Structures are given as structure tokens and as C-alpha cells.
Amino acid sequence: PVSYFKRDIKDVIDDLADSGFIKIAERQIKRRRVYKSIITCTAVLKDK
Amino acid sequence: MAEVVDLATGEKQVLNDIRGRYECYTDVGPSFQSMKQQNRAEILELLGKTPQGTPEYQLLLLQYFTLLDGKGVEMMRDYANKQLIQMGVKKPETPEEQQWLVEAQQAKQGQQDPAMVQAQGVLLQGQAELAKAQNQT
Amino acid sequence: AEILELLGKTPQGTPEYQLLLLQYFTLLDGKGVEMMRDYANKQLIQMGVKKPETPEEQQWLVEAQQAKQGQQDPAMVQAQGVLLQGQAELAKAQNQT
Amino acid sequence: YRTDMRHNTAKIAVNIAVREQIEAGVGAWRLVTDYEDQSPTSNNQVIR
């Protein structure tokens, strides 16, 4: 046993994940995320 | 058998896999079209830099094994395989491989080494015959 | 590379071959490399020099491995006993006299 | 050493330094430390 997963990435799933092999414990992690925003001189069309 | 290792995973629902990921560091090297391409050349590299010794021949067969479809390539690749398994090194992919080969394969070294013992028993029977000579005395 | 350096500067003698196998042993994944690296290993342990990492290595190999030199050297003694049995037969000749 | 010295940062810091060493006669780079939680050289730490 002992495998780890992004809290962020497994949102709506967890339910389906527990009814398969649920388990628990928690820990903090330096990830790094990127965000593509779109822009014209006038305003911003798509953010983050 | 009661032992095994090295199986793959599904990871059912969308977007999942352990966070013990990065096991691969990044280096560079000649660009290849595909994997089979790289393995092919990686063997050629291994040839030439190696004597006409034994390990050479395997590489060789390995080479034919890696070749992609053809009238030519198929037949030889097929021989190369047959040879390699019967070399005992291949360890069959098992689509059939073992059956046709591993049979007669296991049959020879067995036969001989095993026939030599059947007759080696006669080497002792010769001893037994000398014993008979003793019994005769 | 440290092994490649060792090759060339060494004759086609014995120590050469080990280096060689060692070389295949060190190679990283592939259809090609795996099979040969695997042979190279098998060979090396059965050479008795490897000293298995033991993920399984010993079992499949060290067995039949220990089996041959044993068999032979040990079979030669089983029959070497017959070399003395020949002596014993001559002794029988003496007993016959 | 070979681990946290693979990244591009290590290779670069030098070449710049050398480039500079050639033209002006000098050059340099530094070493620093901070935390990585995913794939740390060791002790949840790395050097760079």
C-alpha cells in the first residue's frame, strides 16, 4: 500500500475512489501550477 | 507457480496516478522516429564494437528479431526468434513460441545429458561387471 | 563509460569478457538491451562473480548453476571411487592369488 | 552532486561564467538552498 494523489486533481471523483479502496491521511506539498490568461489592450477575456 | 512481479495498471476514473512520479531524468540524443527504430540502431552500435565472439551472435539474432515486416525480414526474424528461444535466452512472448520450440528444445540437451546418464549407468554396469568378476573370483 | 575506457586497453583475455558482460548489464531499458542485459546478468552470476542482487536472481540461476560444477566434479568422485574400485578389483586379484 | 547538478541551471551558470571569463577575464556563479517536496535530492531539500 501507500500511494499519493493531488487533492486538487481528484475533486468530483473521490466518492468513486473510496468505493474501490478508500484510505486516509494528509500531507502538504510544493506543486507549482500554471495559468494561461488571454488579453487585449482594453480588457481581459479569459482569466486564470 | 506461486510467485510473480511486474504488472501494469489501469487507474480507472479520469486523471489518476501516484504522486511518486518523476523517476525519469531528462537527457538528449539523436532523434528517432519510434522506439523500435532506436532499439534497432542501439544494437548496430553494439555490433562492430564487439568481437566475433559469442555475445556477438545474439546481438545479431536480436537484430533480425527487431526487423519490421517483409518477405525477407519475416522468415529470418522468425528463424532468429526460433534460434533465440532455443538458445534459452529469449524467454518466449508465448503467442505460441514455447510450444513448437521449447518442446523439441527441452528435448535435446535433456535427451543427450539424460541419455548419457542412462548409459552412464552402464559405466557403473561396467563397474557392476567387474564386480561380477569379483563375484566370479 | 568507465568500463568502455577499460575495454580496448585490455587484451581479448578473460578479464575482458567480464567487462563486456558488465557493459550489457549496465545498459538502460529497451527491447534489445533488456534481453542481453538479462543474459549478461545470468552469465555473470553463473560466473559466480556477480553475487546476486537477489530480486530472484539466485533461484533460477544459482540452482542449475551450483548444479553443474558440482555434478561433474562430484560425479567424477563418485566414479573416482570406481578408480579405487579398480584398485579394489586388483585387490580382488590379490585375493584371487 | 550529479543529481541536483543535472538541471539546466547548473550547465548555464557555468557557460555564462566562462563566456565572461574569456572576454573580460572573470566570471562566477553561486550555490543556494530551498525546499522541494516532490523529488528532493534529499531531506526535502536540494541544492542548485
Coordinates of C-alpha atoms in Angstrom, one line a residue:
Chain A
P1 CA 0.0 0.0 0.0
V2 CA 0.9 3.7 0.3
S3 CA 0.1 5.8 -2.8
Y4 CA -0.5 9.6 -3.0
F5 CA -2.7 11.9 -5.1
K6 CA -3.3 15.6 -5.8
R7 CA -6.2 16.9 -3.7
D8 CA -6.7 19.4 -6.4
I9 CA -7.0 17.0 -9.3
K10 CA -9.3 14.4 -7.8
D11 CA -12.3 16.6 -6.9
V12 CA -15.6 15.2 -8.1
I13 CA -14.2 11.7 -8.1
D14 CA -13.2 10.8 -4.5
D15 CA -16.6 9.2 -3.9
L16 CA -15.8 6.8 -6.8
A17 CA -12.3 6.4 -5.4
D18 CA -13.4 5.4 -1.9
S19 CA -15.8 2.7 -3.3
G20 CA -12.8 1.0 -4.7
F21 CA -10.1 1.1 -2.0
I22 CA -10.8 4.1 0.3
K23 CA -8.0 5.1 2.8
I24 CA -6.8 8.2 4.6
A25 CA -4.1 10.6 5.9
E26 CA -2.9 14.0 4.8
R27 CA 0.3 16.0 3.9
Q28 CA 1.4 19.3 2.4
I29 CA 3.2 19.7 -1.0
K30 CA 5.1 22.2 -3.1
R31 CA 3.4 21.7 -6.5
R32 CA 3.7 24.6 -8.9
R33 CA 0.7 25.5 -11.2
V34 CA 0.4 27.5 -14.5
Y35 CA -2.4 29.7 -15.8
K36 CA -3.0 30.9 -19.3
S37 CA -4.9 34.1 -19.5
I38 CA -6.0 36.0 -22.7
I39 CA -5.5 39.7 -23.0
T40 CA -6.2 42.7 -25.3
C41 CA -5.0 46.3 -24.5
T42 CA -8.6 47.1 -23.5
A43 CA -9.5 44.3 -21.0
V44 CA -9.1 40.6 -20.1
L45 CA -11.2 37.9 -21.8
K46 CA -10.1 34.7 -20.1
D47 CA -8.5 34.8 -16.7
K48 CA -6.5 32.2 -14.8
Chain B
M1 CA 4.0 -21.5 -9.7
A2 CA 3.4 -19.2 -6.6
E3 CA 5.4 -16.0 -7.4
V4 CA 5.1 -13.1 -9.8
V5 CA 6.1 -9.4 -10.4
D6 CA 5.9 -6.5 -12.9
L7 CA 2.3 -5.9 -13.9
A8 CA 0.7 -2.8 -15.3
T9 CA -2.2 -0.7 -14.1
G10 CA -5.5 0.8 -15.3
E11 CA -6.1 3.6 -12.8
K12 CA -9.9 3.6 -13.7
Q13 CA -11.6 7.0 -13.4
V14 CA -10.2 10.0 -15.4
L15 CA -6.8 11.7 -14.4
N16 CA -5.1 9.5 -11.8
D17 CA -1.6 8.1 -11.0
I18 CA 0.6 8.1 -7.9
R19 CA 2.4 11.2 -6.9
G20 CA 5.7 9.2 -6.7
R21 CA 6.2 10.1 -10.4
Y22 CA 9.4 11.6 -11.6
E23 CA 11.5 8.6 -11.9
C24 CA 12.9 9.7 -15.2
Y25 CA 15.6 12.4 -15.6
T26 CA 15.9 14.2 -18.9
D27 CA 18.9 13.7 -21.3
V28 CA 19.2 14.2 -25.0
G29 CA 20.3 12.1 -28.0
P30 CA 19.7 11.5 -31.8
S31 CA 16.0 11.9 -32.7
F32 CA 14.3 8.7 -33.5
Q33 CA 11.0 8.1 -35.4
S34 CA 9.9 5.5 -32.9
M35 CA 11.0 3.1 -30.2
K36 CA 11.7 0.1 -32.5
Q37 CA 13.9 2.5 -34.5
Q38 CA 16.0 3.3 -31.5
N39 CA 16.4 -0.3 -30.3
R40 CA 17.4 -1.4 -33.8
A41 CA 20.2 1.1 -34.1
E42 CA 21.2 0.7 -30.4
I43 CA 22.1 -2.9 -31.4
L44 CA 24.1 -1.9 -34.5
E45 CA 26.1 0.4 -32.3
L46 CA 26.7 -2.8 -30.1
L47 CA 28.0 -4.6 -33.2
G48 CA 31.4 -3.8 -34.6
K49 CA 32.5 -2.7 -31.1
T50 CA 32.2 -6.3 -30.2
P51 CA 34.4 -9.3 -31.4
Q52 CA 33.2 -12.2 -33.4
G53 CA 32.8 -13.9 -30.0
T54 CA 29.6 -15.4 -28.7
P55 CA 27.8 -12.4 -27.4
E56 CA 28.1 -11.1 -30.9
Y57 CA 25.9 -13.7 -32.4
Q58 CA 23.0 -12.9 -30.0
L59 CA 23.1 -9.3 -30.8
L60 CA 22.9 -10.4 -34.4
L61 CA 19.9 -12.6 -34.0
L62 CA 18.4 -9.9 -31.8
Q63 CA 18.9 -7.6 -34.8
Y64 CA 16.9 -9.8 -37.2
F65 CA 14.3 -10.2 -34.4
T66 CA 13.8 -6.4 -34.4
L67 CA 13.3 -6.0 -38.2
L68 CA 9.9 -4.9 -39.4
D69 CA 7.7 -6.8 -41.9
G70 CA 8.7 -8.2 -45.2
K71 CA 9.1 -11.4 -47.2
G72 CA 12.7 -11.3 -46.4
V73 CA 12.6 -10.0 -42.8
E74 CA 9.7 -12.2 -41.7
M75 CA 11.3 -15.5 -42.5
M76 CA 14.7 -14.6 -40.9
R77 CA 13.2 -12.7 -38.0
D78 CA 11.2 -15.9 -37.5
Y79 CA 14.4 -18.0 -37.6
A80 CA 16.2 -15.5 -35.4
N81 CA 13.4 -15.9 -32.8
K82 CA 13.2 -19.7 -33.0
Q83 CA 17.0 -19.7 -32.5
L84 CA 16.9 -17.3 -29.6
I85 CA 14.3 -19.1 -27.6
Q86 CA 16.0 -22.4 -28.2
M87 CA 19.1 -20.5 -27.0
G88 CA 17.0 -20.3 -23.9
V89 CA 17.7 -16.6 -23.5
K90 CA 14.7 -15.3 -25.4
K91 CA 12.1 -16.3 -22.8
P92 CA 9.1 -16.6 -25.1
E93 CA 6.4 -13.9 -25.7
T94 CA 4.3 -17.1 -25.7
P95 CA 1.9 -16.3 -28.6
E96 CA 2.7 -19.9 -29.5
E97 CA 6.5 -19.6 -29.3
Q98 CA 7.1 -22.1 -26.5
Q99 CA 5.0 -24.9 -27.9
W100 CA 6.7 -25.5 -31.3
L101 CA 10.2 -24.7 -30.0
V102 CA 10.6 -25.2 -26.2
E103 CA 9.4 -28.8 -26.8
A104 CA 12.0 -30.3 -29.1
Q105 CA 14.1 -27.6 -27.5
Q106 CA 14.0 -29.0 -24.0
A107 CA 14.2 -32.4 -25.7
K108 CA 17.8 -32.4 -26.9
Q109 CA 20.0 -31.3 -24.1
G110 CA 17.7 -33.5 -22.0
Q111 CA 18.0 -36.4 -24.4
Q112 CA 21.7 -36.2 -24.5
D113 CA 22.7 -35.3 -21.0
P114 CA 19.9 -37.6 -19.8
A115 CA 20.8 -40.4 -22.3
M116 CA 24.4 -40.1 -21.2
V117 CA 23.3 -40.9 -17.6
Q118 CA 21.1 -43.8 -18.8
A119 CA 24.3 -45.1 -20.4
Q120 CA 26.5 -43.7 -17.6
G121 CA 24.5 -46.3 -15.6
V122 CA 26.2 -48.7 -17.9
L123 CA 29.5 -47.1 -16.9
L124 CA 28.6 -48.4 -13.5
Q125 CA 27.3 -51.5 -15.1
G126 CA 30.8 -51.9 -16.3
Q127 CA 31.8 -51.5 -12.7
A128 CA 29.0 -53.9 -11.9
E129 CA 30.5 -56.3 -14.4
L130 CA 33.9 -56.0 -12.8
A131 CA 32.0 -56.7 -9.5
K132 CA 30.7 -59.8 -11.3
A133 CA 34.3 -60.6 -12.0
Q134 CA 34.9 -60.3 -8.2
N135 CA 31.9 -62.5 -7.6
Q136 CA 33.4 -64.9 -10.2
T137 CA 36.7 -65.0 -8.2
Chain C
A1 CA 31.9 4.9 -19.9
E2 CA 34.3 3.9 -17.1
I3 CA 34.0 0.4 -18.5
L4 CA 34.4 1.3 -22.1
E5 CA 37.7 3.0 -21.1
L6 CA 38.6 -0.3 -19.5
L7 CA 37.9 -2.1 -22.8
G8 CA 40.4 -1.6 -25.7
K9 CA 43.2 -1.0 -23.1
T10 CA 42.7 -4.7 -22.3
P11 CA 43.5 -7.8 -24.4
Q12 CA 40.9 -10.3 -25.6
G13 CA 41.9 -12.3 -22.5
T14 CA 39.5 -13.4 -19.8
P15 CA 39.1 -10.3 -17.7
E16 CA 37.9 -8.7 -21.0
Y17 CA 34.8 -10.8 -21.3
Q18 CA 33.6 -9.8 -17.8
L19 CA 33.9 -6.1 -18.5
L20 CA 31.9 -6.8 -21.6
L21 CA 29.1 -8.6 -19.8
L22 CA 29.3 -5.9 -17.2
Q23 CA 28.7 -3.5 -20.0
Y24 CA 25.5 -5.1 -21.2
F25 CA 24.5 -5.3 -17.5
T26 CA 24.7 -1.5 -17.2
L27 CA 22.6 -0.7 -20.3
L28 CA 19.3 1.1 -19.7
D29 CA 15.9 -0.2 -20.8
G30 CA 15.0 -1.5 -24.3
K31 CA 13.8 -4.4 -26.3
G32 CA 17.4 -5.0 -27.3
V33 CA 19.2 -4.0 -24.1
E34 CA 16.8 -5.9 -21.7
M35 CA 17.2 -9.3 -23.2
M36 CA 21.0 -9.0 -23.5
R37 CA 21.4 -7.2 -20.2
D38 CA 19.4 -10.2 -18.8
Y39 CA 21.7 -12.7 -20.4
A40 CA 24.7 -10.7 -19.3
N41 CA 23.4 -10.9 -15.7
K42 CA 22.5 -14.6 -15.9
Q43 CA 26.0 -15.3 -17.3
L44 CA 27.7 -13.2 -14.6
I45 CA 26.0 -14.8 -11.6
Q46 CA 26.7 -18.2 -13.0
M47 CA 30.2 -17.0 -13.4
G48 CA 29.9 -16.7 -9.6
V49 CA 31.3 -13.2 -9.6
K50 CA 28.1 -11.3 -9.8
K51 CA 26.9 -12.2 -6.3
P52 CA 23.1 -11.7 -6.9
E53 CA 21.1 -8.6 -6.1
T54 CA 18.6 -11.4 -5.1
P55 CA 15.4 -10.0 -6.6
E56 CA 15.0 -13.6 -7.8
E57 CA 18.4 -13.9 -9.4
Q58 CA 19.8 -16.7 -7.3
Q59 CA 16.8 -19.0 -7.5
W60 CA 16.6 -19.5 -11.3
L61 CA 20.3 -19.4 -11.8
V62 CA 22.4 -20.3 -8.7
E63 CA 20.4 -23.6 -8.7
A64 CA 21.3 -25.2 -12.0
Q65 CA 24.4 -23.1 -11.5
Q66 CA 25.7 -24.8 -8.4
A67 CA 24.4 -28.0 -10.1
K68 CA 27.0 -28.5 -12.8
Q69 CA 30.5 -27.9 -11.4
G70 CA 29.0 -30.0 -8.5
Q71 CA 27.6 -32.7 -10.7
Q72 CA 30.8 -33.1 -12.7
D73 CA 33.5 -32.6 -10.0
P74 CA 31.1 -34.5 -7.7
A75 CA 30.3 -37.2 -10.3
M76 CA 34.0 -37.6 -11.0
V77 CA 34.5 -38.5 -7.4
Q78 CA 31.5 -40.9 -7.5
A79 CA 33.3 -42.6 -10.4
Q80 CA 36.8 -41.8 -9.0
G81 CA 35.6 -44.2 -6.3
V82 CA 35.4 -46.6 -9.2
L83 CA 39.1 -45.7 -9.8
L84 CA 39.7 -47.1 -6.4
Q85 CA 37.2 -49.9 -7.2
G86 CA 39.6 -50.7 -10.0
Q87 CA 42.2 -50.7 -7.3
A88 CA 39.7 -52.8 -5.3
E89 CA 39.4 -55.1 -8.3
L90 CA 43.2 -55.5 -8.4
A91 CA 42.9 -56.2 -4.7
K92 CA 40.4 -58.9 -5.6
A93 CA 43.1 -60.2 -8.0
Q94 CA 45.4 -60.3 -5.0
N95 CA 42.7 -62.1 -3.0
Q96 CA 42.4 -64.4 -6.0
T97 CA 46.1 -65.2 -5.8
Chain D
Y1 CA 26.1 16.0 -6.7
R2 CA 25.2 14.5 -10.1
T3 CA 21.6 14.8 -9.1
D4 CA 21.0 18.4 -8.4
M5 CA 23.6 19.2 -11.0
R6 CA 21.7 17.8 -14.0
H7 CA 19.2 20.7 -14.4
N8 CA 19.8 23.3 -17.0
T9 CA 20.6 25.9 -14.3
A10 CA 23.9 24.2 -13.4
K11 CA 25.0 23.9 -17.0
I12 CA 24.1 27.6 -17.8
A13 CA 25.6 29.2 -14.7
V14 CA 29.0 27.9 -15.9
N15 CA 28.9 28.8 -19.6
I16 CA 27.9 32.3 -18.8
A17 CA 30.8 32.4 -16.3
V18 CA 33.2 31.0 -18.8
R19 CA 31.9 33.3 -21.6
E20 CA 32.6 36.2 -19.3
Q21 CA 35.9 34.7 -18.1
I22 CA 37.1 34.7 -21.7
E23 CA 36.1 38.2 -22.7
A24 CA 36.7 40.1 -19.5
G25 CA 38.8 37.6 -17.6
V26 CA 36.3 36.9 -14.8
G27 CA 33.0 35.1 -14.1
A28 CA 31.1 33.3 -11.3
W29 CA 28.0 31.5 -10.1
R30 CA 26.6 30.8 -6.7
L31 CA 25.0 28.0 -4.8
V32 CA 21.8 28.2 -2.8
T33 CA 19.2 26.1 -1.0
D34 CA 15.5 25.8 -0.6
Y35 CA 12.8 23.1 -0.2
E36 CA 11.4 20.7 -2.8
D37 CA 8.6 18.4 -1.6
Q38 CA 8.3 16.5 -4.9
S39 CA 11.5 14.8 -6.0
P40 CA 14.0 16.3 -3.5
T41 CA 17.7 15.4 -3.7
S42 CA 17.4 14.7 0.0
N43 CA 15.8 15.8 3.3
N44 CA 13.0 17.5 1.4
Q45 CA 16.0 19.7 0.2
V46 CA 18.0 20.2 -2.9
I47 CA 20.9 22.3 -3.9
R48 CA 21.3 24.4 -7.1

